[PDB]
């Protein structure tokens, strides 16, 4: 199993970098693995090919080049195959193998190798994507001979600027049953420029553009490795409008659900992942105009995210970017918008759920995510929490959005507070500050207080949201949050009374799983479980 595999592999990596000469005798046994790549996942494959390749292209062990030829063999053979699973392995192997051999005929070897993988991988869309993803991963992780990167960058730039990038002429080419314009420009850019993107005509000619975002990532990272993070060649690209349908209404085109719906949902999905990759690109840049464009792009992302989650409702079946979350709410109904908040909080929840219980975030430590989020959630999402409490204390679509915003806010708080690094003492400094800001949300001045006092003030702040809660899930999240704070400290009665209150409300529905979790929250924490069950079984009858 996978951790055994991983650990062994790490051991092998350690042993080869430590003592090559000893394992080079028995590298033969390691060559004999290659029959049983049938039971290894892609990631392990990367390290495996790394080891064998650092064996062979260690400079004394090139007399024993048998390894080198045999893996060349399985490369081209495995790489060849029609079936994606096999093509996959060879793809990754080739890429990683190429990486390490390149640290003049070696440059011709990697050239031939990368050209043939690119040529073979052109035909399958999934594989083309994978190449660009994997080649990007390789160029980023490895510092490798800038001649080869100077070779690949001039290829990728040219192929990108002819493949996708077209003129910003206001009429696109294609007989479309849709008002196709150049939408989601910044409009601060010069609109009569050359650089635009042929997204929807490529998507209609499909029925290459699903590989668009990672291909841009690849181009950028060749450019980032060459010019050392100077993005003055590209910064005309976040200026571009994108050739799309008028997406903004998904209510005028309701109850005519065709393959048009699949087209539209996939179109918005690519547009947002495109925009996510632009934010991934230009996040490192400190220039204020660039950051302004990135904020405008987040507003474009977030409004299309509301249209996409709403399109999935009608049709059934980085972290430094949250430095923009310092922007406060401008709630459209009562008077960073509501769709801005739902998208950013949906993003941070979908990251933290995978990460703490995805390659860019996974190459960062979980401790790095928790440390940075403490500055980047609490003292500006408590503002958004307070505005949500103000709104819900007092038309339909913004209520449905801000209920879900409120759910997501409490979900990110629960993910933060349920972290298993806080029984461990080094993270208790973070917890003292975290409760010191939640205690300091109501009134300040009480500093260097005992832990239990900070816990009681934090839960006293978090408990009095209970009247404003619009939906059952936010209630359950609030009680699970109060439980994971109060277990640090008596409060059984509090959790029981609150669970009982939220079982006693009307709730205009409720899924069985949420109500199961709330009943086990009530009955376990009640003073007498027997008299609690006899209370529910002397009301279970007058139903």
């Amino acid at each position: 199993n996978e951790a055994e595999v991983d650990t062994a592999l790490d051991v092998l990596l350690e042993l080869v970098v430590l003592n090559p000469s000893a394992m080079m005798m028995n590298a033969v046994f390691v060559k004999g693995i290659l029959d049983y790549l049938d039971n290894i996942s892609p990631q392990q494959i990367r390290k495996l090919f790394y080891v064998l390749s650092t064996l062979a292209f260690s400079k004394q062990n090139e007399a024993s080049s048998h390894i080198q030829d045999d893996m060349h063999l399985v490369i081209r053979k495995q790489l060849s195959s029609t079936v994606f699973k096999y093509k996959l392995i060879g793809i990754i192997g080739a890429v990683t193998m190429a990486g390490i051999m390149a640290a003049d005929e070696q440059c011709t070897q990697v050239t031939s190798l990368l050209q043939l993988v690119h040529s073979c991988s052109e035909q399958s869309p999934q594989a083309s994507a994978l190449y660009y993803d994997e080649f990007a991963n390789l160029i980023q992780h490895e510092k490798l001979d800038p001649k080869a990167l100077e070779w690949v960058g001039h290829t990728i730039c040219n192929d990108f600027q002819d493949a996708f990038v077209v003129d910003s002429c206001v009429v696109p080419e294609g007989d479309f049953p849709f008002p196709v314009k150049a939408l989601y420009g910044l409009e601060e850019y010069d609109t009569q420029d050359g650089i635009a993107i042929n997204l929807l005509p490529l998507l209609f000619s499909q029925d290459s553009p699903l590989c668009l975002a990672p291909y841009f990532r690849l181009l950028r990272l060749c450019v980032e490795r060459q010019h050392n993070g100077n993005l003055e060649e590209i910064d005309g690209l976040l200026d571009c409008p994108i050739f799309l349908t008028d997406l903004e209404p998904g209510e005028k085109l309701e109850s005519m659900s065709a393959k048009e719906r699949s087209f539209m949902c996939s179109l918005i999905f690519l547009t947002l992942n495109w925009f996510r990759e632009i934010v991934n690109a230009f996040c490192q840049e400190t220039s204020p105009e660039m950051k302004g464009k990135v904020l405008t792009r987040l507003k474009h992302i977030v409004e299309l995210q509301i249209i996409l989650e709403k399109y999935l409702a009608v049709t059934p079946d980085d972290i430094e970017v949250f430095s923009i979350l310092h922007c406060g709410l401008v709630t459209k109904f009562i008077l960073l918008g509501p769709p801005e908040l739902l998208f950013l909080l949906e993003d941070l929840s979908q990251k933290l759920e995978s990460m703490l219980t995805f390659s860019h975030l996974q190459q960062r430590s979980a401790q790095e995510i928790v440390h940075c989020v403490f500055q980047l959630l609490t003292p500006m999402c408590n503002h958004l929490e307070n505005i949500h409490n103000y709104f819900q204390c007092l038309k339909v679509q913004e209520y449905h959005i801000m209920s879900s915003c409120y759910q997501r806010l409490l979900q990110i708080f629960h993910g933060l507070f349920a972290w298993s690094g806080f029984s461990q003492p080094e993270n208790q400094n973070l917890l003292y500050s975290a409760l010191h800001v939640l205690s300091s949300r109501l009134k300040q001045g009480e500093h260097s207080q005992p832990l239990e006092e900070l816990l009681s003030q934090s839960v006293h702040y978090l408990q009095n949201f209970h009247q404003s809660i619009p939906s059952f899930q936010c209630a359950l999240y609030l009680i699970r949050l109060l439980m994971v704070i109060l277990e640090k400290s008596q409060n059984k009665e509090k959790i029981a009374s609150l669970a009982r209150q939220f079982l006693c409300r009307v709730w205009p529905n409720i899924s069985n799983d949420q109500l199961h979790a709330l009943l086990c929250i009530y009955l376990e924490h009640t003073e007498s479980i027997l008299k609690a069950i006899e209370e529910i079984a002397g009301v279970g009858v007058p139903e």
Binding site: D35, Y36, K77, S80, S81, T82, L116, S119, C120, Q123
Partner: protein, 316 residues
């Protein structure tokens, strides 16, 4: 006349080259063979042209693609061309073999069966395509009888026909990479086992290794029953000859060790061995076990999981 196809490819696809096919018409043997003899770098480029030039959307591209294949199989084989060119040209013939309609690949595979009957397969580098074509036949589920049925009868004809005694092992190393069923792997390996008899001994061990790594997605009962029944017969004949020892001892051993390094990664291999070598009722133990079966077991006692099980059987 080589720099009047580089221009043709340098601009656009199937417009001038699909016609440039119908113009020349003579034979892509002089244009490769004699062109290769001087400079093969041309051939690695050239084929990129013809193939982009002869797209399979049209049948007069497809039969020009079906002939260039029948050519370059035969030239790499009979031809003492360099390794370096062959490592490319095959690379191409693999890389492009994916997108064919049904009845051309069965004919290419019939050429391959005809070659395994007769042809001087002086390198089975020619048969490096034979794995991926049975893949690309199976992915096209359309009636040409479907693709998988044609694959089944095709590998039945590979098994029924005589194997090149020289490179029988190299043919058996190809069914390693194809996905197969039980019946298919069983047919191919019981023929690879019929072939131990009609060989030198010193090449039986690596063949046994390439049988076991196949048997990992196939029959184990069969692989080890074959090795055991074979060496059982061998040692009995060595005994009644005594009533070729100094090497018969190297083989038995090297085999036990090669089956060790497999039962090491394949815990089910060991369990099937052990089940095969049960006493159960004492009448199975008076047809099962051997002077070779037991050296093999008493090597096996070194595996940590397996020591104990083994001994207990032997003792009882």
């Amino acid at each position: 006349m080589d720099q009047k196809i580089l221009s043709l490819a340098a601009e656009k696809t199937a417009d001038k080259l699909q016609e440039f096919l119908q113009t020349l018409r003579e034979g892509d043997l002089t244009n490769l063979l004699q062109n290769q003899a001087v400079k093969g770098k041309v051939a690695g480029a050239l084929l990129r042209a013809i193939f982009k030039g002869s797209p399979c959307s049209e049948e007069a591209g497809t039969l020009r693609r079906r002939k260039i294949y029948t050519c370059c199989i035969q030239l790499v084989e009979s031809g003492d061309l360099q390794k370096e060119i062959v490592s490319e040209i095959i690379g191409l013939l693999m890389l492009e073999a994916h997108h064919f309609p049904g009845p051309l690949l069965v004919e290419l595979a019939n050429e391959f069966i005809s070659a395994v009957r007769e042809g001087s397969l002086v390198n089975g580098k020619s048969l490096e395509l034979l794995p991926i074509i049975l893949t690309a036949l199976a992915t096209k589920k359309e009636n040409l009888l479907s693709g998988e049925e044609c694959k089944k009868q095709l590998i039945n004809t590979l098994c029924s026909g005589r194997w090149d005694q020289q490179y029988v092992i190299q043919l058996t190393s190809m069914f390693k990479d194809v996905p197969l069923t039980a019946e298919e792997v069983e047919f191919v390996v019981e023929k690879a086992l019929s072939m131990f008899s009609k060989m030198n001994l010193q090449e039986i061990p690596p063949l046994v290794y390439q049988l076991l790594v196949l048997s990992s997605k196939g029959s184990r009962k069969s692989v080890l029953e074959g090795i055991i029944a074979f060496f059982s017969a061998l040692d009995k004949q060595h005994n009644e000859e005594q009533s070729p020892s100094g090497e018969l001892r190297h083989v038995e051993g090297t085999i036990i060790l090669h089956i060790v390094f497999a039962i090491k990664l394949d815990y089910e291999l060991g369990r099937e061995l052990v089940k095969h070598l049960k006493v159960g009722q004492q009448g199975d133990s008076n047809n099962n076990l051997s002077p070779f079966s037991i050296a093999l077991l008493l090597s096996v006692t070194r595996i940590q999981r397996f020591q104990d099980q083994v001994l207990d059987l032997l003792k009882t």
